[PDB]
Amino acid sequence: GVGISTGTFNNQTEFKFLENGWVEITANSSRLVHLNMPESENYRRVVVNNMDKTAVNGNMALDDIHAQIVTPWSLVDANAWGVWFNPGDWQLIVNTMSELHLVSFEQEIFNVVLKTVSETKVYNNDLTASLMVALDSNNTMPFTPAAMRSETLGFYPWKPTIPTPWRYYFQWDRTLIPSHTGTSGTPTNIYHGTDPDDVQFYTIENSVPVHLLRTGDEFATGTFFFDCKPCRLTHTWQTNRALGLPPFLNSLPQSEGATNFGDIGVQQDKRRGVTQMGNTNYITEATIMRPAEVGYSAPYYSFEASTQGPFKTPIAAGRADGNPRYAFGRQHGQKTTTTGETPERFTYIAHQDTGRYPEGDWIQNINFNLPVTNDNVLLPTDPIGGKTGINYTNIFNTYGPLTALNNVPPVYPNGQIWDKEFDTDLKPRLHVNAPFVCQNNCPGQLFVKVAPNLTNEYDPDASANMSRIVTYSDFWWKGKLVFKAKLRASHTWNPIQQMSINVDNQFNYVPSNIGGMKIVYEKSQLAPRKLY
Amino acid sequence: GVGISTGTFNNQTEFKFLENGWVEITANSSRLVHLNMPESENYRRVVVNNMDKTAVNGNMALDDIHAQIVTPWSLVDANAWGVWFNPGDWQLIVNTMSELHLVSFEQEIFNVVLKTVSETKVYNNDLTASLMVALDSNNTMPFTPAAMRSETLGFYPWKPTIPTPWRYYFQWDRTLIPSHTGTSGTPTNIYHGTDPDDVQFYTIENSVPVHLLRTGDEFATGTFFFDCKPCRLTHTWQTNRALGLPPFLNSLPQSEGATNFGDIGVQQDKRRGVTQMGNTNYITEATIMRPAEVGYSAPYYSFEASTQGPFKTPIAAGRADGNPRYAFGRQHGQKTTTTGETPERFTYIAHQDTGRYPEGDWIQNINFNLPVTNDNVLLPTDPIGGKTGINYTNIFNTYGPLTALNNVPPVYPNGQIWDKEFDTDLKPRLHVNAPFVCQNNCPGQLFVKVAPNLTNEYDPDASANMSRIVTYSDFWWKGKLVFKAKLRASHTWNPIQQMSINVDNQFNYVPSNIGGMKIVYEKSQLAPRKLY
Amino acid sequence: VGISTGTFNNQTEFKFLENGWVEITANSSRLVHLNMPESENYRRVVVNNMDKTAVNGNMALDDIHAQIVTPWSLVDANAWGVWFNPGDWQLIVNTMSELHLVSFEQEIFNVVLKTVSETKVYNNDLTASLMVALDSNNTMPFTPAAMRSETLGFYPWKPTIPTPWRYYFQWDRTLIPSHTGTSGTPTNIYHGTDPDDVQFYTIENSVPVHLLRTGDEFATGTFFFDCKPCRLTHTWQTNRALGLPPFLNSLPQSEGATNFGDIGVQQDKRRGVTQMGNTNYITEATIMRPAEVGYSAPYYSFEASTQGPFKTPIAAGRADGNPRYAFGRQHGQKTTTTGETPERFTYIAHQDTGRYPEGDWIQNINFNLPVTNDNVLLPTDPIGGKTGINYTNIFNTYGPLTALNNVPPVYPNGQIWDKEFDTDLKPRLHVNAPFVCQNNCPGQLFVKVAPNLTNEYDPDASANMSRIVTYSDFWWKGKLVFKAKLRASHTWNPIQQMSINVDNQFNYVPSNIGGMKIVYEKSQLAPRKLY
List beta partners, residue A118: A122
What backbone phi and psi angles, to 5 degrees, belong to B270?
Answer: -120, 20
| Secondary structure class of A74 (helix, strand, coil) | strand
Distance CA B226, CA B212 (A): 29
Contacts of A413 in chain C (CB under 8 A): none
Which chains pack against A, by 3+ Cβ pairs within 8 A? B, C
Distance CA A46, CA A69 (A): 6
Nearest to C482 by CA among C57, C98, C61: C98
What backbone phi and psi angles, to 5 degrees, belong to B409?
Answer: -70, 150
| Secondary structure class of A410 (helix, strand, coil) | coil
Q: How far is CA A310 from CA A302, A481, B410, C336, in A?
A: 10, 37, 81, 63
Specify the DSSP class assigned to residue A94: H
Distance CA B303, CA C363 (A): 8
DSSP class per residue in C486-506? E----SSS--------STTGG
Distance CA B428, CA C166 (A): 39
What backbone phi and psi angles, to 5 degrees, belong to C82?
Answer: -65, -25
Nearest Cα of chain C lies from the Cα of B186 at a distance, in angstroms, of: 14
> Which residue on chain C is closest to B411 by alpha carbon?
C273
What backbone phi and psi angles, to 5 degrees, belong to B92?
Answer: -65, -40
Distance CA A93, CA A89 (A): 6
Nearest Cα of chain C lies from the Cα of B255 at a distance, in angstroms, of: 44
| Secondary structure class of C158 (helix, strand, coil) | coil
Chain centroid offset of residue C310 CA: 17
Distance CA A327, CA A330 (A): 11
Nearest Cα of chain C lies from the Cα of B358 at a distance, in angstroms, of: 11
CA-based diameter of chain B, in Å?
Answer: 98
Taking residue A222's Cβ as centre, other Cβ atoms within 10 Å add up to 11
| Secondary structure class of B197 (helix, strand, coil) | helix
Distance CA A235, CA A527 (A): 6
> Which residue on chain C is closest to B177 by alpha carbon?
C359
Nearest to B459 by CA among C417, C105, A312, A36: A36
Taking residue A186's Cβ as centre, other Cβ atoms within 10 Å add up to 10
Distance CA C325, CA B13 (A): 63
Q: Which residues contact residue A450 at a Cβ distance below 8 angstroms, ignoring those fewer than 6 apart? A: A35, A36, A37, A38, A114, A129, A130, A131, A132, A471, A472, A473
* CB-based contact B469 A123, cutoff 8 Å: yes
Tell the burial category of A373 from Cβ atoms under 10 Å away from its Cβ (0-12, 13-18, 19+): exposed
Tell the burial category of B447 from Cβ atoms under 10 Å away from its Cβ (0-12, 13-18, 19+): buried
| Secondary structure class of B108 (helix, strand, coil) | strand
Q: Which residues contact residue A440 at a Cβ distance below 8 angstroms, ignoring those fewer than 6 apart? A: A227, A421
CB C52 within 8 A of CB C64: no
Please say whether the structural domain A1-532 has been given the CATH code 2.170.30.10. Answer: yes
Top residue of C99, C371, C394 to mutate, by most chain B CBs within 10 Å, is C371
Nearest to A187 by CA among A358, A56, A296, A86: A56
| Secondary structure class of A428 (helix, strand, coil) | coil
Q: How far is CA B431 from CA A221, B406, C529, in A?
A: 52, 11, 18
Nearest Cα of chain C lies from the Cα of B134 at a distance, in angstroms, of: 16
Contacts of A254 in chain C (CB under 8 A): 513
Count residue pairs from A and B with Cβ separation < 8 A: 143
Distance CA A163, CA A169 (A): 18
Nearest to B519 by CA among B332, B355, B376: B332
Contacts of B456 in chain A (CB under 8 A): 36, 117, 470, 472
Breaks (C-N over 2.5 A) in chain C follow: 118, 318
CB B284 within 8 A of CB B297: no
Specify the DSSP class assigned to residue C189: E
Nearest to C442 by CA among C231, C220, C228: C220
DSSP class per residue in B392-442? GGGG-----TTEE-PPPPP-BTT---EEEPP-SSB--S--TT-SEEESSS-
Distance CA B412, CA B416 (A): 9
Q: Which residues contact residue C192 at a Cβ distance below 8 angstroms, ignoring those fewer than 6 apart? A: C172
> Which residue on chain B is closest to C362 by alpha carbon?
B302
Amino acid at the residue A12? Q
Residues composing chain A: 532
Contacts of B395 in chain C (CB under 8 A): 362, 377, 391, 394-395
Nearest Cα of chain B lies from the Cα of C229 at a distance, in angstroms, of: 9
> Which residue on chain A is closest to B207 by alpha carbon?
A12
Q: Which residues contact residue A458 at a Cβ distance below 8 angstroms, ignoring those fewer than 6 apart? A: A466, A467
Q: Taking phi first (over 0 means left), then psi (-120 to 50 degrees means alpha), and beta for anything else, what does residue C294 get?
A: left
Report which secondary-structure segment, H or E, holds B185: none
List beta partners, residue A116: A124, A471
Q: Which residues contact residue A507 at a Cβ distance below 8 angstroms, ignoring those fewer than 6 apart? A: none
User: Would the CA dihedral through C525, C528, C530, C531 be positive or negative?
Assistant: positive
- Cis-peptide into C442, omega within 30 deg: no
Tell the burial category of A134 from Cβ atoms under 10 Å away from its Cβ (0-12, 13-18, 19+): buried
| Secondary structure class of C28 (helix, strand, coil) | strand
Tell the burial category of A378 from Cβ atoms under 10 Å away from its Cβ (0-12, 13-18, 19+): middle
Nearest Cα of chain B lies from the Cα of C486 at a distance, in angstroms, of: 16
Taking residue B95's Cβ as centre, other Cβ atoms within 10 Å add up to 16
Top residue of C491, C509, C521 to mutate, by most chain A CBs within 10 Å, is C491
Report which secondary-structure segment, H or E, holds A161: none
| Secondary structure class of A165 (helix, strand, coil) | strand
Nearest to C279 by CA among C367, C200, C215, C345: C367
Contacts of B165 in chain C (CB under 8 A): 247
Pairing status of strand B189-193 against strand B173-176: antiparallel
Amino acid at the residue A9? F
* CB-based contact C391 B395, cutoff 8 Å: yes
Q: Which of A5, A8, A154 sits opposite B460 (nearest CB)?
A: A154
Taking residue B359's Cβ as centre, other Cβ atoms within 10 Å add up to 10
The tally of CA atoms less than 13 A away on the side-chain side of residue C170 is 14
* CB-based contact C271 B328, cutoff 8 Å: yes
Contacts of A509 in chain B (CB under 8 A): 199, 201
Task: Summarize the annotated binding site of A for Mg(2+) as residue ranges.
Answer: 138
Contacts of A253 in chain C (CB under 8 A): 512-513
Which chains pack against C, by 3+ Cβ pairs within 8 A? A, B
Nearest Cα of chain B lies from the Cα of A15 at a distance, in angstroms, of: 13
What backbone phi and psi angles, to 5 degrees, belong to A7?
Answer: -155, 175
Contacts of A514 in chain C (CB under 8 A): 252-255
Distance CA C33, CA C515 (A): 21
Q: What is the dihedral of CA C405, C407, C411, C417, to 10 degrees?
A: -110
Distance CA B506, CA B520 (A): 11
Distance CA C82, CA C163 (A): 15
Nearest to B96 by CA among B23, B12, B19, B13: B23
Resolution (A): 3.8
Taking residue A279's Cβ as centre, other Cβ atoms within 10 Å add up to 8
State which approach was used to obtain the coordinates. Answer: cryo-EM
Q: Which of C91, C486, C495 sits opposite A501 (nearest CB)?
A: C495
* CB-based contact C20 A15, cutoff 8 Å: yes
Tell the burial category of A451 from Cβ atoms under 10 Å away from its Cβ (0-12, 13-18, 19+): middle
Taking residue A295's Cβ as centre, other Cβ atoms within 10 Å add up to 23
CB B27 within 8 A of CB B85: yes
Domain positions in chain A are 1-532
CB C96 within 8 A of CB A96: no
Tell the burial category of A24 from Cβ atoms under 10 Å away from its Cβ (0-12, 13-18, 19+): middle
User: Would the CA dihedral through C369, C374, C377, C378 be positive or negative?
Assistant: positive
Report which secondary-structure segment, H or E, holds B29: strand B22-36
Distance CA B304, CA B301 (A): 10
Q: Taking phi first (over 0 means left), then psi (-120 to 50 degrees means alpha), and beta for anything else, what does residue B220 get?
A: beta
Top residue of B2, B5, B43 to mutate, by most chain A CBs within 10 Å, is B43
Contacts of C398 in chain B (CB under 8 A): 397, 399
Nearest Cα of chain C lies from the Cα of A296 at a distance, in angstroms, of: 28
Q: Which residues contact residue B491 at a Cβ distance below 8 angstroms, ignoring those fewer than 6 apart? A: none
> Which residue on chain B is closest to C241 by alpha carbon?
B169
> Which residue on chain B is closest to C370 by alpha carbon?
B58
Q: Taking phi first (over 0 means left), then psi (-120 to 50 degrees means alpha), and beta for anything else, what does residue C6 get?
A: left
Q: Which of B49, B324, B329 sits opposite C273 (nearest CB)?
A: B324
* CB-based contact A496 C259, cutoff 8 Å: no
Q: Which of C87, C261, C508 sits opposite A490 (nearest CB)?
A: C87
* CB-based contact A494 C486, cutoff 8 Å: no
CB A175 within 8 A of CB A352: no
Pairing status of strand B418-420 against strand B436-438: parallel
List beta partners, residue B15: B25
Contacts of A19 in chain C (CB under 8 A): 16
Distance CA C72, CA C134 (A): 12
Supply the angle between the helices C86-95 and A87-96 in degrees, to the nearest 10. 150
CATH, range C1-531:
2.170.30.10
Amino acid at the residue C163? T
Distance CA B381, CA A331 (A): 69
SS3 of C79-114: the string is CHHHCCCHHHHHHHHHHEEEEEEEEEEEEEEEEEEE
Amino acid at the residue A381? T
Q: Which of C292, C493, C531 sits opposite B314 (nearest CB)?
A: C292
CB C75 within 8 A of CB C447: yes
Taking residue C191's Cβ as centre, other Cβ atoms within 10 Å add up to 10
> Which residue on chain C is closest to B56 by alpha carbon?
C370
Distance CA B451, CA A499 (A): 35
Distance CA A244, CA A240 (A): 9
Q: Which of A2, A86, A511 sits opposite B45 (nearest CB)?
A: A511
Distance CA A173, CA A191 (A): 6
